[PDB]
Amino acid sequence: DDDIAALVVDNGSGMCKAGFAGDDAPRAVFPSIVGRPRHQGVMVGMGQKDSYVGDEAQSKRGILTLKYPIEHGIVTNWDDMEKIWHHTFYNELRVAPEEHPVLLTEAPLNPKANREKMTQIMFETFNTPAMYVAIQAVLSLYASGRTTGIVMDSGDGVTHTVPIYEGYALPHAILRLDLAGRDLTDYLMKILTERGYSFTTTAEREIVRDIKEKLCYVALDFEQEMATAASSSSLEKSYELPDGQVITIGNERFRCPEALFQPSFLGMESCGIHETTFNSIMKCDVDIRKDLYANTVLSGGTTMYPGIADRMQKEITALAPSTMKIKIIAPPERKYSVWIGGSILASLSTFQQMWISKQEYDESGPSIVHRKCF
Amino acid sequence: DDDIAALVVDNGSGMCKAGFAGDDAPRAVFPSIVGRPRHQGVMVGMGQKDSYVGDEAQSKRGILTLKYPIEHGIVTNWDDMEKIWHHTFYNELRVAPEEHPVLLTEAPLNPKANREKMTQIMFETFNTPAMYVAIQAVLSLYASGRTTGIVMDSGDGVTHTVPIYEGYALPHAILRLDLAGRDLTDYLMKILTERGYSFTTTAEREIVRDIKEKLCYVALDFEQEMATAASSSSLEKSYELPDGQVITIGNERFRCPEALFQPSFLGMESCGIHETTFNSIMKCDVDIRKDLYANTVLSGGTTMYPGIADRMQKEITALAPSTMKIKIIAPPERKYSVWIGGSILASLSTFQQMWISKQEYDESGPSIVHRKCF
Amino acid sequence: DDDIAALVVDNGSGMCKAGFAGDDAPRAVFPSIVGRPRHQGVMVGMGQKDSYVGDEAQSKRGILTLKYPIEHGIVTNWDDMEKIWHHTFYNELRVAPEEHPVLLTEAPLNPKANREKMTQIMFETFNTPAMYVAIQAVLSLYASGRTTGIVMDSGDGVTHTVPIYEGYALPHAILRLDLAGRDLTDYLMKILTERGYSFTTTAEREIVRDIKEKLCYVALDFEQEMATAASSSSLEKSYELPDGQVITIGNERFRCPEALFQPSFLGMESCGIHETTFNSIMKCDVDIRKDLYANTVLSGGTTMYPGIADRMQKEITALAPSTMKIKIIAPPERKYSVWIGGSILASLSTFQQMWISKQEYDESGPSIVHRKCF
Amino acid sequence: PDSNIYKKPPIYKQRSKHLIEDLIIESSKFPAAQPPDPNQPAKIETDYWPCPPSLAVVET
Amino acid sequence: DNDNSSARLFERSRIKALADEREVVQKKTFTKWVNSHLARVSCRITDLYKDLRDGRMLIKLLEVLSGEMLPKPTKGKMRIHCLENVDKALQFLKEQRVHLENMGSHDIVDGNHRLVLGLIWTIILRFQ
Ligand SMILES: Nc1ncnc2c1ncn2[C@@H]1O[C@H](COP(=O)(O)OP(=O)(O)O)[C@@H](O)[C@H]1O
Ligand SMILES: Nc1ncnc2c1ncn2[C@@H]1O[C@H](COP(=O)(O)OP(=O)(O)O)[C@@H](O)[C@H]1O
Ligand SMILES: Nc1ncnc2c1ncn2[C@@H]1O[C@H](COP(=O)(O)OP(=O)(O)O)[C@@H](O)[C@H]1O
């Protein structure tokens, strides 16, 4: 069916994006949050809504307990995930899920039951004719337009590095780090108590996330930046709360993202993202290491702090041998790249035979995804 | 007949060479390897390539396992040999095999089934009008241009000495030694371990072979060179790995080829190449030995080490009586000499009588090759 | 005997064993791990410790980062080795090192700088009167009580096969494989992610090692065992973590040691241990292969999985010719077996002539060991 | 060993209502909720596609 | 090093020169042969190595030679769509039981001279 176009649903811990195949941009982007009321209702006849999904929960942060169904790339609560998928299909896109194939994404290293539950829910509740599950790291390489390179993807829930040479992927060199954007948000909310600002509930967690998105950067030299910040007040900015209160972020702007490079601030003994990328490169074979050095690819929202590319290049160049050439590739639209290449994956002619059919699922149970999908 | 030129194909264990008759140099020279992928294939739409053969098998050696169809001059796997021959005929030379006859080379002492299967393959599948099989060390004497002499041919698979006097070859004095650059590469890979460098995969064996071809030489005196290497560091040289790492070979440079003269480093009980040549000389009659002393011919790629000729001349002079004059003839083009001899043999007007016609093969089966040829 | 009994020290990658000569069992066995504090120091008044060595570092894994001085049989860090040797000599055995000769063990193929540095440390710092260095496989053959056989010793860092015929070893037939218990532990960590259990820090490495030691076995037939495990719930075991949580391992129990026989599970292209042993046998002479077939000796902790002997016998018998029988002699004492052999080597009267005297070390230097040992 | 992937139909192709509601159902399948413009190139042909093209196109 | 330099001189001069002359002559002749059949439709190639990368002209040439309808090329300008377009022609050649060895889509896309020339030669041997 040439008329039928598959839906690409980029599914992450922080945001959910959805669109049609062959399109350069997703149609609907919205936060993946679920809120329920926490205060007494005294006005009769106002309504009977008891669950808020998406921007409707984000607007009414005052009277809701916001919570995330997906934590560290794993769907902890499945009822809220069904809620999010229903709101995606019917209210955001206005399409019938029974007429289209659905393409879904997930982290590389997952519990194996997650794929089976996702496939069973997509086949039984929505009656999709076909579906497929892909890995978010490969789709960024599709979006970058190159067949070889190493993909470092860090989103709201999980960080992972995957190297691919000439279209061939090495599984033993895949590295997963649980450091992500929510840990940075929690670190910012912890270090903001030094100046006297206390943020404790979920709405203030959203406020802290907005502060981190708007006012943060990565220092090229940490100690020199700390000395400069202690010397004068040139590295200071002001932010206005919804209460109208004005806070001064000051020194903390380059301290929150630095926990990505030094995880010992958060109590974790794991290596930094630059060291993880270097280890993933060095785990590969000798002949292909130069091409992986030349084609490092950055992806995910968390990698849009200003100056992260220069710091990453400097650290890798310090780690790597001096005679090799190091390049860091950071597209300006990288936040959506995991979606974009996925749409490309749905636009290929040979991919039409890679869908998991409804008949195949009926024949083989939910465990068909392990032998059909990478 | 005049414009039609028979193809000349030199087929050793290491590399395959091919060209037209009457040419001074072969048109196509490429290694004889067949590689296959081993890792995951995850990018959809890149196309499927089952096997890699030839020079472009070397370029993508990072994601391939490499196999040699010919071991010790014997075709162990015949399907890969058909792959190599097809790639030679079509991609490298762009000639139809029906148009021209084919001239092949082989080792002196080989199993009969190798010759029978070579004849059967070159008649039944490629459909050639004529074909001839010759000895490499005989063609080396054609390239040298002299009627009499002893040829010591050392390639990647096997070393052999044949004497020829006045165009007559003595079959009982032909000597074969299974000591070539293949075992020297293995020995270099073994002795590089004690300096801290470890090469185990089949892809790293090509790197070890390149190191051998770039930084090896034959010492004229072994003990004095060992004392010099122990005393000073002037013998040390540096090599750069493909990933930018730098290694220092140092003492090993004159120890890897020294296994040619003393096989006891490899555990072999056999004699050295100089003793093999001397024994092949003394297995002949008394009268011709003087002439066999004056026309020793070196050939093959293994004899390209610097200083091999001086050491060989010194050892033969030490073994031979003092009243005889010993000289070693080593042209600069001794790697390709066999092929040149083949062309000189293929363009003779007399040799047009000696081709094996297709009708004779159809009458006599694959057993016709032993009655003709040699 | 009027001679001070020499100390026998087995220095492997995983554990260190130490005892006196002529004793049937080692006195001190403890892990070779050097831990360091990583958290913030409060509660002034209690004594501080610079580092934790050995068993004590296993008692307080929560507040330490845990590191190995030996990686792949090579001493990467030498200060930690000096600390471990000091703790062995003064805390565990509580003897004066200057009164006793010292016997040490190492891997067959390793850099010579390791031997030179161990000799330099044991003469210059600990000031021992004499020492000797031996290969672990030879000591295993000593402990087996037979003179002729082939030894496959696999510790926590390296695997090696050495054939010895009537007191004569073949250097060309010695094979080394870098596949040991630590790679199996890493593979177990990677495959435990499928069930949802995450172990990342160095403290959880010991927990995963305990899980591997307690609940793993080698299946006789891999495919039949996989079918049986997928068929029903007959094969699951429950393990209790030190935090109180209970995990179920199930399918993984026979999948972790299977990587010993199929290294392609780890991404390596090397052969299995059965193919390595068979190739080591085939590299020997024709006459001694029959004796080597019937005298196969297993040693090392990594060969302590249940069912390893029957599986190894089946795999070797498949490759071997049908006319002979294959014996797999696995002593119940194999984990300590190397040390036992060392004690026997320290009890012979003729071994007293082979000690490297202190005067000899002053005479020649640290380079004497290559002339003296092996 | 000898077959063509593209000539075969897609796998997902294998398996009363009001006519106007059927029309609105199958009008919503298009990405623009309407039939595409006939003489208009698709999104991949257009140069405002954010992803970089192949190297030969860059040389051209 | 002197004889090593002489050997490098020999295999730098003669082996390169003969092969380059032969491949230049083959390139011109193959260009004329392809242009003769491709002139029935309004298509023409100037360089054999460069115009055959995108895979469209290979499909047009195979459509002209064979006489039936190949599947239409993938609508794209990326490297992946380029690989797909070359793979379609290679699979169509796999229909006709023409034997191709060491031929992949990426080899044509990258522009290896010898393999492209061998592909054209194999097509000529089949469809003449
Ligand atoms: N412009 C920005 N600058 C800095 N950080 C950002 C920006 N936009 C988003 N982030 C961070 O990235 C996270 C969102 O990541 P996202 O790409 O949604 O992950 P996923 O899509 O995998 O769920 C947010 O938690 C936020 O902290
Ligand atoms: N320049 C060189 N110097 C030293 N050894 C060489 C050199 N070139 C090749 N060799 C050795 O010769 C081998 C190739 O020999 P080759 O001539 O291909 O044998 P054959 O053609 O009979 O198979 C290589 O494996 C290498 O060991
Ligand atoms: N009972 C057991 N069952 C399974 N594996 C074991 C057992 N005991 C030890 N091991 C494995 O063997 C390793 C210890 O080997 P060891 O003999 O100490 O090596 P070395 O002494 O050469 O360092 C441990 O890492 C462990 O994984």
DSSP string, chain E: -HHHHHHHHHHHHHHHHHHHHHHHHHHHHHHHHHHHHHTTTT---S-HHHHTSSSHHHHHHHHHHH-S-PPPPPS--SHHHHHHHHHHHHHHHHHTT----S--HHHHHHT-HHHHHHHHHHHHHH--
CB contact under 8 A, C267 and A172: yes
Closest CA to B7 of B19, B17, B16, B15: B19
Task: Give kind and range of the element (H or E) at residue B152.
Answer: strand B149-154
Q: What Rg, from alpha-carbon coordinates, does chain E have?
A: 17
Give the Cα separation of C184 and B347 in Å (integer): 63
Say if C178 is an interface residue toward chain B (CB within 8 Å). yes
Which residue type, as a one-letter code, is found at position C46? M
Say if C352 is an interface residue toward chain A (CB within 8 Å). no
Contact B57, B95 (CB under 8 A): no
The closest ligand to the CA of A257 turns out to be: 1
Quick check: helix, strand or coil at residue A17?
Answer: strand
Angle at CA of residue B319, ends B318 and B325, nearest 5°? 70
3-class DSSP string for chain C: CCCCCCEEEEECCCEEEEEECCCCCCCEEEECCEEEECCCCCCCCCCCCCCEECHHHHHCHHHEEEECCEECCEECCHHHHHHHHHHHHHHHCCCCHHHCCEEEEECCCCCHHHHHHHHHHHHHCCCCCEEEEEEHHHHHHHHHCCCCEEEEEECCCCEEEEEEECCEECHHHCEEECCCHHHHHHHHHHHCCCCCCCCCCCHHHHHHHHHHHHCCCCCCCHHHHHHHHHHCCCCCCEEECCCCCEEECHHHHHCCCHHHHCHHHHCCCCCCHHHHHHHHHHCCCCCCHHHHHHCEEEECHHHHCCCHHHHHHHHHHHHCCCCCCCCEECCCCHHHHHHHHHHHHCCCCHHHHCCEEHHHHHHHCCCHHHHHCC
Q: Tabulate helix, strand, coil % of chain A (nearest 5).
A: 45, 20, 40
Is A touching C (3+ C-beta pairs, cut-off 8 A)? Answer: yes
Pocket of ligand 2 (CB under 6 A): B 12-15, 155-157, 181, 184-185, 209, 212-213, 300-302, 304-305, 335
The answer for D19, left when phi > 0, alpha when psi is -120 to 50, beta otherwise, is: alpha
Give the Cα separation of D15 and D22 in Å (integer): 19
CB contact under 8 A, B196 and C171: no
Kindly report the length of chain D. 60
List of chain E residues whose C-beta atoms are within 8 Å of the C-beta of residue B48 = 104
Give the Cα separation of C187 and A9 in Å (integer): 32
Kindly report the length of chain E. 128
List of chain C residues whose C-beta atoms are within 8 Å of the C-beta of residue A74 = 196
Contact B117, B170 (CB under 8 A): no
Residue B237 has which token pair? 């040289």
Breaks in chain B (C–N > 2.5 Å) following residue: none
Pocket of ligand 1 (CB under 6 A): A 12-15, 155-157, 181, 209, 212-213, 216, 300-302, 304-305, 335
Ligand 1 atom nearest the C-alpha of A302 is 12
Q: Which residues in A116-172 belong to E strands, given as ranges?
A: 130-135, 149-154, 159-165, 168-169
CB atoms closer than 10 angstroms to residue C214: 10
Contact B89, B15 (CB under 8 A): no
Contact A107, A158 (CB under 8 A): yes
What are the residues facing C280 on neighbouring strands? none
Q: CA dist C284 to C165, C173, C278, C321, Å? A: 10, 6, 10, 16
Angle at CA of residue C181, ends C177 and C182, nearest 5°? 100
Chains that touch B (3 or more CB pairs under 8 A): A, C, E
The closest ligand to the CA of C257 turns out to be: 3
Residue that has been written with the tokens 């050439």 in this structure = A325
Contact C107, C176 (CB under 8 A): yes
Q: H helices then E strands: how many in chain B?
A: 13, 20
List of chain A residues whose C-beta atoms are within 8 Å of the C-beta of residue C195 = 111-112
Within B25-148, residue ranges assigned H as helices are: 55-59, 78-86, 112-124, 136-144
Q: What Rg, from alpha-carbon coordinates, does chain D have?
A: 19
Contact A359, D14 (CB under 8 A): yes
User: Going by CA atoms, what residue is nearest to atom 20 of ligand 1?
Assistant: A12
Which residue type, as a one-letter code, is found at position A362? D
* CATH 3.90.640.10 correct for C181-260: yes
Q: Phi first, then psi: what are they for A360, rounded to 5°?
A: -65, -40
Task: Give kind and range of the element (H or E) at residue D55.
Answer: helix D55-59
CB contact under 8 A, E88 and D6: yes
Ligand 3 centroid distance, CA of C179 (Å): 13
Give the Cα separation of E91 and E82 in Å (integer): 14
* DSSP conformation class of B90: I
Contact C136, C84 (CB under 8 A): no
Give the Cα separation of A168 and A181 in Å (integer): 30
List of chain A residues whose C-beta atoms are within 8 Å of the C-beta of residue B41 = 167-169
Distance from CA of D26 to the nearest CA of E (A): 24
Contact A160, B57 (CB under 8 A): no
Is E touching B (3+ C-beta pairs, cut-off 8 A)? Answer: yes
Give the Cα separation of A60 and A42 in Å (integer): 17
Give the Cα separation of E86 and E107 in Å (integer): 10
Residue that has been written with the tokens 């060179």 in this structure = B225
* DSSP conformation class of B214: H
CB atoms closer than 10 angstroms to residue B22: 12
Ligand 1 centroid distance, CA of A303 (Å): 8
The closest ligand to the CA of A105 turns out to be: 1
Burial label, A7 (beta-carbon count in 10 A; 0-12, 13-18, 19+): buried
Which residue type, as a one-letter code, is found at position A334? R
Angle at CA of residue C97, ends C96 and C98, nearest 5°? 95
The closest ligand to the CA of B304 turns out to be: 2
Contact C321, C175 (CB under 8 A): no
Residue B34 has which token pair? 């067949």
Give the Cα separation of C316 and C328 in Å (integer): 10
Closest CA to B191 of B271, B254, B268: B254
User: Going by CA atoms, what residue is nearest to atom 17 of ligand 1?
Assistant: A301
User: Going by CA atoms, what residue is nearest to atom 7 of ligand 1?
Assistant: A213
What are the residues facing B159 on neighbouring strands? B154, B177
Find the closest chain A residue to C269 by CA distance.
A285
Angle between helices A308-319 and A273-282 (to 10 degrees): 50
CB contact under 8 A, A143 and D43: no
Quick check: helix, strand or coil at residue B27?
Answer: coil
The dihedral through the CA atoms of E89, E95, E101, E102 has a sign that is positive
Distance from CA of A345 to the nearest CA of E (A): 10
Name, in order, each residue with C-beta under 8 angstroms of B122's C-beta and a sequence gap of 6 or more: B102, B104, B128, B131
The dihedral through the CA atoms of C46, C51, C53, C57 has a sign that is positive
What resolution, expressed in A, was reported for this entry? 3.5
First to last CA, chain B: 25
Quick check: helix, strand or coil at residue B66?
Answer: strand
Angle at CA of residue B286, ends B281 and B289, nearest 5°? 40
Contact B177, B160 (CB under 8 A): yes
Q: CA dist C230 to C195, C253, C307, Å? A: 14, 13, 21
Q: CA dist B19 to B75, B131, C330, C358, E117, Å? A: 21, 15, 59, 67, 17
Interface of A with D (CB under 8 A): 1, 3-5, 20, 22-24, 94-96, 99-101, 129-130, 143-145, 331, 333, 340-341, 344, 347, 349-350, 352-353, 355, 357-360
Distance from CA of B274 to the nearest CA of C (A): 23
Give the Cα separation of C284 and A7 in Å (integer): 63
Name, in order, each residue with C-beta under 8 angstroms of C283's C-beta and a sequence gap of 6 or more: C170, C172, C173, C175
User: Going by CA atoms, what residue is nearest to atom 3 of ligand 3?
Assistant: C213
Give the Cα separation of A292 and B243 in Å (integer): 10
Which residue type, as a one-letter code, is found at position C167? G
Give the Cα separation of E124 and E128 in Å (integer): 6
Breaks in chain A (C–N > 2.5 Å) following residue: none
Pocket of ligand 3 (CB under 6 A): C 12-15, 155-157, 181, 209, 212-213, 300-302, 304-305, 335
Q: Tabulate helix, strand, coil % of chain B (nearest 5).
A: 40, 20, 40
Closest CA to B116 of B157, B71, B75: B75
What are the residues facing A104 on neighbouring strands? A9, A133
Quick check: helix, strand or coil at residue A372?
Answer: helix
User: Probe ligand 1: pick from A156, A177, A305, max atoms within 8 Å of CB?
Assistant: A156
Ligand 1 centroid distance, CA of A9 (Å): 17
Give the Cα separation of C143 and C336 in Å (integer): 10
Name, in order, each residue with C-beta under 8 angstroms of C167's C-beta and a sequence gap of 6 or more: C147
Quick check: helix, strand or coil at residue D56?
Answer: helix
Question: Exposure pattern of C173-210 as b/e (b: 16+ CB <10 Å)?
Answer: bbbbbbbbbbbbbebbbbbbbeeebebeebbbbbbbbe
Breaks in chain D (C–N > 2.5 Å) following residue: 15
CB atoms closer than 10 angstroms to residue C278: 19
Give the Cα separation of B8 and B342 in Å (integer): 6
Quick check: helix, strand or coil at residue B185?
Answer: helix
Is D touching E (3+ C-beta pairs, cut-off 8 A)? Answer: yes
Q: What Rg, from alpha-carbon coordinates, does chain C have?
A: 22
Contact B10, B30 (CB under 8 A): no
Max CA separation in chain E (angstroms): 61
Residue C31 has which token pair? 């892990």
Name, in order, each residue with C-beta under 8 angstroms of A290's C-beta and a sequence gap of 6 or more: A324, A325, B242, B243, B244
Give the Cα separation of C308 and C298 in Å (integer): 10
Closest CA to B139 of B178, B108, B114, B101: B108
Question: Exposure pattern of C97-111 as b/e (b: 16+ CB <10 Å)?
Answer: beebbbbbbbbbbbb
The dihedral through the CA atoms of A295, A301, A307, A312 has a sign that is negative
3-class DSSP string for A77-113: CHHHHHHHHHHHHHHHHCCCHHHCCEEEEECCCCCHH
Residue C327 has which token pair? 């014996």
Give the Cα separation of B26 and B93 in Å (integer): 10
